[PDB]
Amino acid sequence: NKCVNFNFNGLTGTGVLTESNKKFLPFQQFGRDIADTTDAVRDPQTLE
Amino acid sequence: IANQFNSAIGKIQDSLSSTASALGKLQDVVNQNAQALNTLVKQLSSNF
C-alpha cells in the first residue's frame, strides 16, 4: 500500500503492491497487462 | 397540425427507444477514439 521500487525474482520495477484475488495456477509466477507489462506477481517466499 | 406534430414527436420516442443503430454517427466516433487508444496501448507490447 506504499509506492516502492520492487524486485521479485529479478523483475525490477516501481509501483504500489496490493492484495489481489487473482488465482495463479502453480506454474505461473507473473501476470501481465495487455501492454505486456507485469501487473501481478506471486511472492516467492509466502505464495500469495 | 398540432396533433400531427405531437404524433411525430411520439414516433421519435418510439424509434429511439426501440432501435440500437440510430446513434451510429456518435457511437462510431467513440469507437474510433477507443480503438485508437487500445491500439496505442497494445503497440507497447511489440519488440521492434
Curated annotation (Swiss-Prot), chain A:
Attaches the virion to the cell membrane by interacting with host receptor, initiating the infection. The major receptor is host ACE2. When S2/S2' has been cleaved, binding to the receptor triggers direct fusion at the cell membrane. When S2/S2' has not been cleaved, binding to the receptor results in internalization of the virus by endocytosis using host TFRC and GRM2 and leading to fusion of the virion membrane with the host endosomal membrane. Alternatively, may use NRP1/NRP2 and integrin as entry receptors. Binds to host ACE2. RBD also interacts with the N-linked glycan on 'Asn-90' of ACE2. Cleavage of S generates a polybasic C-terminal sequence on S1 that binds to host Neuropilin-1 (NRP1) and Neuropilin-2 (NRP2) receptors. Interacts with host integrin alpha-5/beta-1 (ITGA5:ITGB1) and with ACE2 in complex with integrin alpha-5/beta-1 (ITGA5:ITGB1). May interact via cytoplasmic c-terminus with M protein. May interact (via N-terminus) with host bilirubin and biliverdin, thereby preventing antibody binding to the SARS-CoV-2 spike NTD via an allosteric mechanism. This is Spike protein S1. It comes from Severe acute respiratory syndrome coronavirus 2 (2019-nCoV). The gene is S. The chain holds residues 536 to 583 of 1273 of the full protein.
